[PDB]
Design a protein around this ligand. Structure first.
Ligand SMILES: Cc1cc2nc3c(=O)[nH]c(=O)nc-3n(C[C@H](O)[C@H](O)[C@H](O)COP(=O)(O)O)c2cc1C
Ligand code: SF4
Ligand code: SF4
Ligand code: SF4
Ligand code: SF4
Ligand code: SF4
Ligand code: FES
Ligand code: FES
Lengths: 212, 41, 430, 54, 66, 230, 59
């Protein structure tokens, strides 16, 4: 599934590219956070920084990181293609991930999936016939107490429903972001009832302590 | 208490994690080297 | 002795499940962080290990390790190689919602726990690995680190005593195998993310060649409270052998699925109905119940109505106890399709060291898809039992076993639905 | 034939589909199946008499 | 000269005499008559190897890809 | 003093610490079937073939990379030993294409010899077996990426001896490819010495490719020329 | 099942069915099969010298 080079345009290094020296100060901070003698531990956060700079990551960034961090570049390509954060097919801004595995399928995933499908038009895994909207489905993301979830770039959406699908994507295509918390009430992982957890405001060290 | 006492996270930008990592760059324990700077030194 | 677990307040361990007074070190000091901890830290390592082995804390993480024995294996003298405490802040086993809640609400008690762990067994610094999908709560932990460093209460010469200790938080990039024990370690080490062999233990070579240990967020978050709270009273919770307090993550076809805090032992019907909603339409409506999440065989109606929730009880009931993902499923869904989606998860996240998990998860993907469509004769399903007994314990990691167990539970309890499914599709093919 | 593909070569459908049949076919017709060491004799009642093979 | 085959004037080209020792080899060669050249037997020297030696904090064996 | 008692099926032998199960069995005369081990290369537990049973051991371990404690006893003919090897053999021969005629190592395979002497016969898995596109690693080494059993012996050889370090694994799970990511050719020293190391017929010789077959060639001692090492 | 002429087949609307895989030399008991292969001018493995010694064939 395109895991070899494929020297397309906006590729075939050196595609012209350069960082910010403020980001080089970040790189020096992360290498400061690691023990010397095993300097190659900075590959994942530095390469995450390269993704947060340039949306889908190209290859000249990886070649520059391999030049800086004194590693042979094939290890950098291994760590690049090994994960799903690091996408090399060209993507855009709104990176919709629909999470669906065990409770998310079991609580109407395909209603949400066909809602996204007939709202965006294009098929899953693909993108729109312009930029900035890439739709993929993914594995578990940790909203297991909720509906099958909608992840946009470092933001969650929980407890959805098809009318909320329509309203959220109306504001997204219009350029408005709602609160990235849950929906259908329950502002945390809550039982929606009348406080089935603790009721009294707790004390702490007033009751049981030891060796104080 | 009937109000979500988070939502100080609600205003996150892109560079917040790495900017915090740069903001805590000081008073560090030296993270000690062992001879070399890399195994392919 | 107690009546096999029935939790009541004023006697919990850790608070702030959802939306409490604030999120601040002021509120953490109101709840009870940083209370007289210097006398706990500055005392002696064997006393901490004795408090562990007296309270009977069980090693969490979905597996069931012994706590104090491993942390006493961590007692090599400090040579010219430091010692690391790797906090596994991940969530595997879909159904989980385990430590997302902790690291969103109460990070400062994890600071308590990692400091107690580093001073406890002789460590030097803690490296936290959080999953890459956790930007919000990881940055909340970052702001908590900035608070604790503006106060400066941990770091060089923490707690006013001569013992430096630092915590370095590293985010992930997305894999189930990052949530493992040793591919965790070599995701920290900047390699590609793949495990090591088990006969080199973390007691000799862990993080780069430092004798390290891997700790769960449940055990870290309980760990200072074990010492400072009631000793041999944490052993008085639930069953005496496996004693503890734990989350319970009830998702599935219930009214408002969520997570709760309880003790160790509980009847499962009391857990499902009397603490978190209840089964939509009736208790007898559901098709099946799975505890554990993904690493656990299934439980039918007549077993889930009565069996108390304990590790050895579930093991001799042929199941694991994972990270409290105790979910249900109604008869309106295709449970074979649910198992096949789990096998699709196993195919999407597995590495390629071991030949058998790779090849077996490929065979189980294609054959469980065929059982969703009901293709062959039941010689195929006993062949699936053959391969599922072939894989077990022939791996490096536990993902091969975790791919073995749901297929095993399916064969052990849901024979006739598969028989009728394959006969239906045989008569439709003809 | 016998129920052992390491003794007899398989037939055409297994040869054209299954992997283990082709591996057994190929090494059975290059090397032949390995035989444990032994100095045996048998004899049959051929119409000429005691036909012995040693 | 008709097929390009390798016609040889050699009876003694395809022989292979299978022995178990070296002294009996010398004895058979002196017994039947001809001369001979002798190679030794060069067993593999066992070397210490370990996965816990493949990993190290302060030694320069680093696979960096596993 | 560093003389460790292990029993091969009951028979005693003295073994240095750090040396594995396999060097003990090579000391007594046994071999264990193996792929990702090689006696003059690095050690990892990838290929899973070398599984073995110890008396009083409910956990079957890979005998390539085990530190040997004092006083073992090793079963090399037991029940679940052969069961585990036949299972793993049925696993390895599923994603391998029917190419044993057109393979160049047909006389000198390893899957073939171990599938005779240690494998099952009546296979399963009626439909599947994906295939992987190749790319030329150079002009001198013919490359088919399909027959790779992903044993990771070429990779560690490159990483520890060749130093070129352009040969890694991409992808995950089933979909793992071996070799080059950036389609760059491999022309360094000892690039011909990967046809002796690849235990299956994946990375084979380009100029030799289809001119002979191993069971028809008689061998003769010779000395290396155009060097000074021999 | 009678065994005479020792012919060769080719593909249905196609070229030479042989590969030069040499199993027929490996099983030919009088060694009448003489095969020296060459790959052709495109790369797919084929032959040069294919010889059935009919004076030696034992059918
Ligand atoms: C396949 C696999 C999955 C795992 N999943 C998790 C997980 O979801 N969460 C976690 O904290 N640890 C997970 N672990 C790691 C172990 O639970 C961890 O090494 C162990 O719990 C640490 O020791 P403890 O008993 O003191 O917690 C997993 C390990 C494996 C091999
Ligand atoms: S069992 Fe599979 S996922 Fe686990 S270490 Fe082996 S190859 Fe990787
Ligand atoms: S390497 Fe593969 S294709 Fe070649 S002979 Fe062996 S099993 Fe057959
Ligand atoms: S190319 Fe050969 S040596 Fe390299 S991993 Fe594949 S089978 Fe092993
Ligand atoms: S070499 Fe012989 S056995 Fe092989 S394909 Fe050609 S004719 Fe058939
Ligand atoms: S003797 Fe004739 S029939 Fe027999 S194997 Fe040789 S060519 Fe074929
Ligand atoms: S499965 Fe969707 S969040 Fe865990
Ligand atoms: S040789 Fe031990 S696993 Fe490959």
């Amino acid at each position: 599934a395109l895991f070899v080079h494929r020297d397309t345009p906006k590729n075939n290094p050196e595609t012209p590219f350069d960082f910010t020296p403020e980001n080089y100060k970040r790189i020096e901070a992360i290498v400061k956070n690691y023990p010397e003698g095993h300097k190659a531990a900075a590959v994942l956060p530095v390469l995450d920084l390269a993704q947060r700079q340039n949306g889908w990551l190209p290859i000249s960034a990886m070649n520059k990181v391999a030049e800086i961090l004194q590693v042979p570049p094939m290890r950098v390509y291994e760590v690049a293609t090994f994960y799903t954060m690091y996408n090399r097919k060209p993507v855009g801004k709104y990176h919709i991930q629909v999470c669906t595995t065990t409770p998310c399928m079991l609580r109407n995933s395909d209603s949400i999936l066909e809602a996204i499908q007939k709202k965006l038009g294009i098929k899953v895994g693909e993108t729109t016939p312009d930029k900035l909207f890439t739709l993929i489905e993914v594995e578990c993301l940790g909203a297991c107490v909720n509906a099958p979830m909608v992840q946009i770039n470092d933001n969650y959406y929980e407890d959805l429903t098809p009318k909320d699908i329509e309203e959220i994507i109306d504001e997204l295509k219009a350029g408005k972001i709602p609160k990235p918390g849950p929906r259908s009430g329950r502002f945390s992982c809550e039982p929606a009832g009348g406080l089935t957890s603790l009721t009294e405001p707790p004390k702490g060290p007033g009751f049981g302590v030891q060796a104080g | 208490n009937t109000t979500y006492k988070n939502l100080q996270h609600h205003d996150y930008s892109t560079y917040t994690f790495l900017d915090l990592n740069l903001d805590l760059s000081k008073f560090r324990m030296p993270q000690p080297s062992s001879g070399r700077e890399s195994p392919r030194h | 002795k107690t009546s096999f677990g029935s939790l009541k307040d004023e006697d919990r361990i850790f608070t702030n499940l959802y939306g409490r007074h604030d999120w601040r070190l002021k509120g953490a000091q109101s709840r009870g962080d940083w209370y007289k901890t210097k006398e706990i830290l500055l005392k002696g390592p064997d006393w901490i290990l004795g408090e562990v082995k007296t309270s009977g804390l069980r090693g969490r993480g979905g597996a069931g390790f012994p706590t104090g024995l491993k942390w006493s294996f961590m007692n090599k003298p400090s040579d010219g190689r430091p010692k690391y405490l790797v906090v596994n802040a991940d969530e595997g086993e879909p159904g989980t919602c385990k430590d997302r809640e902790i690291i969103r609400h109460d990070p400062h008690k994890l600071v308590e726990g990692c400091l107690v762990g580093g001073r406890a067994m002789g460590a030097r610094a803690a490296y936290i690995y959080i999953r890459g999908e956790f930007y919000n709560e990881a940055s909340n932990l970052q702001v908590a680190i900035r608070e604790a460093y503006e106060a400066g209460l941990i770091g060089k010469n923490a707690c006013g005593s001569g013992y430096d200790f630092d915590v370095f938080v590293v985010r992930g990039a997305g894999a189930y195998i990052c949530g493992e024990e040793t591919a965790l370690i070599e995701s920290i080490e900047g390699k590609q993310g793949k495990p090591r062999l088990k006969p080199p233990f973390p007691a000799d070579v862990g993080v780069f060649g430092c004798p390290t240990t891997v700790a769960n967020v449940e055990t870290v978050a309980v760990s200072p409270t074990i010492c400072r709270r009631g000793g041999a009273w944490f052993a008085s919770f639930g069953r005496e052998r496996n004693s503890g307090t734990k989350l319970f993550n009830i998702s599935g076809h219930v009214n408002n699925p969520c997570t709760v805090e309880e003790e160790m032992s509980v009847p499962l019907k009391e857990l499902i109905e009397k603490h978190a909603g209840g089964v939509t339409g009736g208790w007898d409506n559901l098709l099946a119940v799975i505890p554990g999440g993904s690493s656990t065989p299934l439980i039918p109606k007549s077993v889930c109505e009565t069996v108390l929730m304990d590790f050895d009880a579930l093991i001799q009931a042929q199941t694991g106890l994972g990270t409290a993902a105790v979910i249900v499923m109604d008869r309106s869904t295709d449970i074979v399709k649910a198992i096949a989606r789990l096998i699709e998860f196993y195919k999407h996240e597995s590495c390629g060291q071991c030949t058998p998990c790779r090849e077996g998860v490929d065979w189980m993907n294609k054959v469980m898809a065929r059982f969703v469509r009901g293709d062959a004769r039941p010689a195929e399903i006993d062949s699936l039992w053959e391969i599922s007994k072939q894989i077990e314990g022939h791996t490096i990691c536990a993902l091969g076993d975790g791919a073995a167990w749901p297929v095993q539970g399916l064969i052990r309890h849901f024979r006739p639905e598969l028989e009728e499914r394959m006969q239906r599709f045989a008569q439709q093919h003809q | 034939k016998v129920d052992d593909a390491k003794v007899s070569p398989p037939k055409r459908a297994e040869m054209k589909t299954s992997m283990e049949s082709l591996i057994h076919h190929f090494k059975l017709y290059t090397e032949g199946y390995q035989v444990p060491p032994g100095a045996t004799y048998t004899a049959i009642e051929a119409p000429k008499g005691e036909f012995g093979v040693y | 000269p008709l097929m390009g085959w390798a016609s040889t004037a050699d009876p003694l080209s395809n022989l292979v005499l299978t022995f178990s020792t070296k002294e009996d080899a010398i004895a058979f060669a002196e017994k039947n008559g001809w001369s001979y050249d002798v190679e030794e037997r060069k067993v593999p020297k066992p070397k210490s190897k370990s996965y816990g030696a493949n990993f190290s904090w302060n030694k320069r064996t680093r696979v960096s890809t596993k | 003093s560093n003389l460790i008692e292990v029993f091969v099926d009951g028979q005693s032998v003295m073994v240095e610490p750090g040396t594995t199960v396999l060097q003990a069995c090579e000391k007594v005369g046994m071999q264990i079937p193996r792929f990702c081990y090689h006696e003059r290369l690095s050690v990892a537990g990838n290929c899973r073939m070398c599984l073995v049973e110890i008396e009083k051991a409910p956990k079957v371990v890979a005998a390539c990379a085990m530190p040997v404690m004092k006083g073992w006893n090793i079963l090399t003919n037991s029940e679940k030993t052969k069961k585990a090897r036949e299972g793993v053999m049925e696993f390895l021969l599923a994603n391998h294409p029917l190419d044993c005629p057109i393979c160049d190592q047909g006389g000198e395979c390893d899957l073939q010899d171990q599938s005779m002497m240690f494998g099952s016969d009546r296979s399963r898995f009626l439909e599947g077996k994906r295939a992987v596109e190749d790319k030329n690693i150079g002009p001198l080494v013919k490359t088919i990426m399909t027959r790779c059993i992903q044993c990771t012996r070429c990779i560690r050889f490159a990483s520890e001896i060749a130093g070129v370090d352009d040969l890694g694994t991409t992808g995950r799970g089933n979909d793992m490819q071996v070799g080059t990511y950036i389609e760059k050719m491999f022309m360094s020293e000892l690039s011909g010495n990967i046809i002796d190391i690849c235990p299956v017929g994946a990375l084979t010789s380009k100029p030799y490719a289809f001119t002979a077959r191993p069971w028809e060639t008689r061998k003769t001692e010779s000395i290396d020329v155009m060097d000074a090492v021999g | 099942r009678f065994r005479g002429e020792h012919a060769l087949r080719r593909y249905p609307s196609g070229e030479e069915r042989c590969i030069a895989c040499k199993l027929c030399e490996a099983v030919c008991p009088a060694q009448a099969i003489t095969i020296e292969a060459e790959p052709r001018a495109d790369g797919s493995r084929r032959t040069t010298r294919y010889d059935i010694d009919m004076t030696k064939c034992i059918y």
